[PDB]
Coordinates of N, CA and C in Angstrom, one line a residue:
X8 N 110.0 86.2 121.1 CA 109.8 87.3 120.2 C 108.4 87.7 120.0
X9 N 108.0 88.9 120.3 CA 106.7 89.4 120.1 C 106.3 89.5 118.6
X10 N 105.0 89.2 118.3 CA 104.5 89.3 116.9 C 103.1 89.8 116.9
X11 N 102.7 90.6 116.0 CA 101.3 91.1 115.9 C 100.6 90.1 115.0
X12 N 99.3 89.8 115.4 CA 98.5 88.9 114.6 C 97.7 89.6 113.6
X13 N 97.8 89.1 112.3 CA 97.0 89.7 111.3 C 96.4 88.6 110.4
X14 N 95.2 88.8 110.0 CA 94.4 87.8 109.3 C 94.0 88.3 107.9
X15 N 93.9 87.3 107.0 CA 93.5 87.7 105.6 C 92.9 86.5 105.0
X16 N 91.9 86.8 104.1 CA 91.1 85.7 103.5 C 91.9 85.1 102.3
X17 N 91.9 83.7 102.2 CA 92.5 83.0 101.1 C 92.2 83.6 99.8
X18 N 93.2 83.8 98.9 CA 93.0 84.4 97.6 C 93.0 85.9 97.5
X19 N 93.0 86.6 98.7 CA 93.0 88.0 98.7 C 94.4 88.5 98.9
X20 N 94.5 89.8 99.3 CA 95.8 90.4 99.6 C 95.9 91.0 101.0
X21 N 97.2 91.2 101.4 CA 97.4 91.7 102.7 C 98.5 92.8 102.7
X22 N 98.3 93.9 103.3 CA 99.3 94.9 103.5 C 100.0 94.6 104.8
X23 N 101.3 94.4 104.7 CA 102.2 94.2 105.9 C 103.0 95.5 106.2
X24 N 102.6 96.2 107.2 CA 103.3 97.5 107.4 C 104.7 97.4 108.0
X25 N 105.6 98.3 107.5 CA 106.8 98.6 108.2 C 106.6 99.9 108.9
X26 N 106.8 99.9 110.2 CA 106.5 101.1 111.0 C 107.7 101.8 111.5
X27 N 108.9 101.5 111.0 CA 110.0 102.3 111.4 C 109.8 103.7 111.0
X28 N 110.1 104.6 112.0 CA 110.0 106.1 111.6 C 111.0 106.9 112.3
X29 N 111.4 107.9 111.6 CA 112.5 108.8 112.1 C 112.4 110.2 111.4
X30 N 112.3 111.2 112.2 CA 112.2 112.6 111.6 C 113.3 112.9 110.7
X31 N 114.5 112.7 111.3 CA 115.7 113.2 110.6 C 116.7 112.1 110.2
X32 N 116.3 110.9 110.5 CA 117.2 109.7 110.3 C 116.7 108.7 109.2
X33 N 115.6 109.1 108.5 CA 115.1 108.2 107.5 C 115.9 108.5 106.2
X34 N 117.1 108.1 106.2 CA 118.0 108.4 105.1 C 119.0 107.3 104.7
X35 N 119.0 106.9 103.4 CA 119.9 105.8 102.9 C 119.8 104.6 103.8
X36 N 118.6 104.1 104.0 CA 118.4 102.9 104.8 C 118.5 101.7 104.0
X37 N 119.1 100.6 104.6 CA 119.0 99.3 104.1 C 117.9 98.6 104.7
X38 N 117.1 97.8 103.9 CA 116.0 97.1 104.5 C 115.9 95.6 103.9
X39 N 115.2 94.8 104.7 CA 114.9 93.4 104.3 C 113.6 93.0 104.9
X40 N 112.8 92.2 104.2 CA 111.7 91.4 104.8 C 112.1 90.0 104.8
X41 N 111.8 89.3 105.9 CA 112.0 87.8 105.9 C 110.8 87.1 106.3
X42 N 110.8 85.8 106.0 CA 109.7 84.9 106.3 C 110.2 83.7 107.1
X43 N 109.4 83.4 108.2 CA 109.7 82.2 109.0 C 108.5 81.4 109.3
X44 N 108.6 80.0 109.0 CA 107.7 79.1 109.6 C 108.5 78.0 110.3
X45 N 107.8 76.9 110.7 CA 108.5 75.9 111.5 C 109.9 75.5 111.1
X46 N 110.1 75.0 109.9 CA 111.4 74.8 109.4 C 111.6 75.4 108.0
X47 N 111.2 76.7 107.9 CA 111.4 77.4 106.6 C 111.8 78.8 106.9
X48 N 112.8 79.3 106.1 CA 113.3 80.7 106.2 C 113.5 81.2 104.8
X49 N 113.1 82.4 104.5 CA 113.3 83.0 103.2 C 113.5 84.4 103.4
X50 N 114.4 85.0 102.6 CA 114.5 86.4 102.4 C 113.5 86.8 101.3
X51 N 112.5 87.6 101.6 CA 111.5 88.0 100.7 C 111.8 89.1 99.8
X52 N 112.4 90.2 100.3 CA 112.7 91.4 99.5 C 113.8 92.1 100.3
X53 N 114.7 92.7 99.5 CA 115.8 93.5 100.2 C 116.2 94.6 99.3
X54 N 116.6 95.7 99.9 CA 117.0 96.8 99.1 C 117.5 98.0 99.9
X55 N 117.5 99.2 99.3 CA 117.9 100.4 99.9 C 116.8 101.5 99.6
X56 N 116.7 102.5 100.5 CA 115.8 103.6 100.1 C 116.4 104.9 100.5
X57 N 116.5 105.9 99.6 CA 117.2 107.1 99.9 C 116.6 107.9 101.0
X58 N 115.2 108.0 100.9 CA 114.5 108.8 101.9 C 113.0 108.3 102.0
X59 N 112.2 109.0 102.8 CA 110.8 108.6 103.0 C 109.9 108.7 101.7
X60 N 110.3 109.4 100.7 CA 109.5 109.6 99.5 C 110.2 109.2 98.2
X61 N 111.3 108.4 98.3 CA 112.0 108.1 97.1 C 111.6 106.7 96.6
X62 N 112.1 106.4 95.4 CA 111.8 105.1 94.8 C 112.8 104.1 95.4
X63 N 112.3 103.1 96.1 CA 113.2 102.2 96.7 C 114.0 101.4 95.7
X64 N 115.2 101.1 96.0 CA 116.0 100.3 95.1 C 115.9 98.9 95.6
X65 N 115.3 98.0 94.8 CA 115.1 96.6 95.2 C 116.2 95.7 94.6
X66 N 117.0 95.1 95.5 CA 118.1 94.3 95.0 C 117.8 92.8 95.0
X67 N 116.8 92.4 95.8 CA 116.4 91.0 95.9 C 114.9 91.0 96.0
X68 N 114.3 90.0 95.3 CA 112.9 89.8 95.5 C 112.5 88.3 95.2
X69 N 111.9 87.7 96.1 CA 111.7 86.2 96.0 C 110.5 85.9 95.1
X70 N 109.5 86.8 95.0 CA 108.2 86.5 94.4 C 107.5 87.7 93.9
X71 N 106.9 87.6 92.7 CA 106.2 88.8 92.1 C 104.9 89.1 92.7
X72 N 104.4 88.2 93.7 CA 103.2 88.5 94.5 C 103.5 89.6 95.5
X73 N 104.8 90.0 95.7 CA 105.2 91.0 96.6 C 105.4 92.3 95.9
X74 N 104.8 93.4 96.4 CA 105.1 94.7 95.9 C 105.3 95.7 97.0
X75 N 106.1 96.7 96.8 CA 106.2 97.7 97.9 C 105.0 98.6 97.8
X76 N 104.5 99.2 98.9 CA 103.2 99.9 99.0 C 103.2 101.1 98.1
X77 N 104.3 101.8 97.9 CA 104.4 103.0 97.0 C 103.8 104.2 97.6
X78 N 103.8 104.4 98.9 CA 103.2 105.5 99.6 C 103.6 105.5 101.1
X79 N 103.4 106.6 101.8 CA 103.5 106.6 103.2 C 102.2 107.2 103.8
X80 N 101.8 106.8 105.0 CA 100.7 107.3 105.6 C 100.7 107.0 107.1
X81 N 100.8 108.1 107.9 CA 101.0 107.9 109.3 C 102.2 107.1 109.6
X82 N 102.1 106.0 110.3 CA 103.2 105.1 110.7 C 103.6 104.1 109.7
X83 N 102.9 104.0 108.6 CA 103.2 103.0 107.5 C 104.2 103.7 106.5
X84 N 105.4 103.1 106.4 CA 106.4 103.8 105.5 C 106.5 103.1 104.2
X85 N 107.4 103.6 103.3 CA 107.5 103.1 101.9 C 108.2 101.8 101.8
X86 N 108.6 101.2 102.9 CA 109.2 99.8 103.0 C 108.1 98.8 103.2
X87 N 106.9 99.2 103.6 CA 105.8 98.3 103.7 C 105.5 97.5 102.4
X88 N 105.0 96.3 102.5 CA 104.7 95.5 101.3 C 103.3 95.0 101.3
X89 N 102.9 94.7 100.1 CA 101.6 94.1 99.8 C 101.9 92.7 99.3
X90 N 101.3 91.7 99.9 CA 101.4 90.3 99.3 C 100.0 89.9 98.8
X91 N 100.0 89.7 97.5 CA 98.7 89.3 96.7 C 98.5 87.9 96.6
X92 N 97.3 87.5 96.1 CA 97.0 86.1 95.8 C 97.4 85.2 96.9
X93 N 96.9 85.4 98.1 CA 97.3 84.7 99.2 C 96.9 83.2 99.2
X94 N 97.8 82.3 99.7 CA 97.6 80.9 99.7 C 97.8 80.5 101.2
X95 N 97.2 79.3 101.6 CA 97.3 78.9 103.0 C 98.8 78.7 103.4
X96 N 99.6 78.4 102.4 CA 101.0 78.3 102.6 C 101.7 79.6 103.0
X97 N 101.1 80.7 102.8 CA 101.6 82.0 103.2 C 101.5 82.3 104.7
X98 N 100.7 81.5 105.4 CA 100.7 81.7 106.9 C 102.1 81.6 107.4
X99 N 102.4 82.4 108.4 CA 103.8 82.4 109.0 C 104.2 83.8 109.5
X100 N 105.4 83.9 109.9 CA 105.9 85.1 110.5 C 106.7 86.0 109.5
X101 N 106.3 87.3 109.4 CA 106.9 88.2 108.4 C 107.6 89.3 109.2
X102 N 108.9 89.4 109.0 CA 109.7 90.4 109.8 C 110.3 91.4 108.9
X103 N 110.2 92.7 109.3 CA 110.9 93.7 108.6 C 112.2 94.1 109.4
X104 N 113.2 94.5 108.7 CA 114.5 94.8 109.2 C 115.0 96.1 108.6
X105 N 115.4 97.1 109.3 CA 115.9 98.4 108.8 C 117.1 98.8 109.5
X106 N 118.1 99.2 108.7 CA 119.4 99.7 109.4 C 120.0 100.8 108.5
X107 N 120.5 101.8 109.2 CA 121.4 102.8 108.6 C 122.9 102.3 108.8
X108 N 123.5 101.7 107.8 CA 124.8 101.1 108.0 C 126.0 102.0 108.2
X109 N 125.8 103.3 108.1 CA 126.8 104.3 108.4 C 126.8 104.7 109.9
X110 N 125.7 104.3 110.5 CA 125.5 104.5 112.0 C 126.0 103.2 112.7
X111 N 126.1 103.3 114.0 CA 126.6 102.1 114.8 C 125.4 101.3 115.4
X112 N 124.2 101.7 115.2 CA 123.1 101.2 116.0 C 122.8 99.7 115.6
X113 N 122.0 99.1 116.5 CA 121.5 97.8 116.2 C 120.4 97.9 115.1
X114 N 120.0 96.9 114.4 CA 119.0 96.9 113.4 C 117.6 97.0 114.1
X115 N 116.7 97.8 113.4 CA 115.3 97.9 113.9 C 114.5 96.8 113.2
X116 N 113.6 96.1 113.9 CA 112.8 95.0 113.4 C 111.5 94.8 114.1
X117 N 110.5 94.3 113.4 CA 109.3 93.9 114.1 C 108.7 92.7 113.3
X118 N 107.9 91.9 113.9 CA 107.3 90.7 113.3 C 105.8 90.7 113.3
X119 N 105.2 90.3 112.2 CA 103.8 90.1 112.1 C 103.5 88.6 111.9
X120 N 102.6 88.0 112.6 CA 102.2 86.6 112.3 C 100.9 86.7 111.4
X121 N 101.1 86.3 110.2 CA 100.0 86.3 109.2 C 99.3 84.9 109.3
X122 N 98.0 84.9 109.5 CA 97.2 83.7 109.3 C 96.2 83.9 108.2
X123 N 96.3 83.0 107.3 CA 95.4 83.0 106.1 C 94.2 82.1 106.5
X124 N 93.0 82.6 106.2 CA 91.7 81.9 106.6 C 90.8 81.5 105.5
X125 N 89.8 80.7 105.7 CA 88.9 80.2 104.7 C 88.1 81.3 104.1
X126 N 87.9 81.3 102.8 CA 87.0 82.2 102.1 C 85.6 81.9 102.4
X127 N 84.7 82.9 102.5 CA 83.3 82.7 102.7 C 82.4 82.8 101.5

């Protein structure tokens, strides 16, 4: 499984982009972010979004350090998250998942490997 490396200073915040894009198919999407480390798995946030500019309906959220970005810009969509107040324990793989459940397609997903580093 391919993963993009991203780095962030301890105690700061990181924007984790969801880059799913669709001209005419960004409609009533189900989404989920997950976290994986060696022997850890968590669902971080889950919900639905009506379109590219609507208020996402969040049905599950593991931690208030996570917020949705609240905007779109180029390839970063409204499903992207910001994780604040970073701790070394936050290092690990963060995966977004998007699906239109009325369609037959496989889910779309990509993984970011976040590494938290020492403050200077």
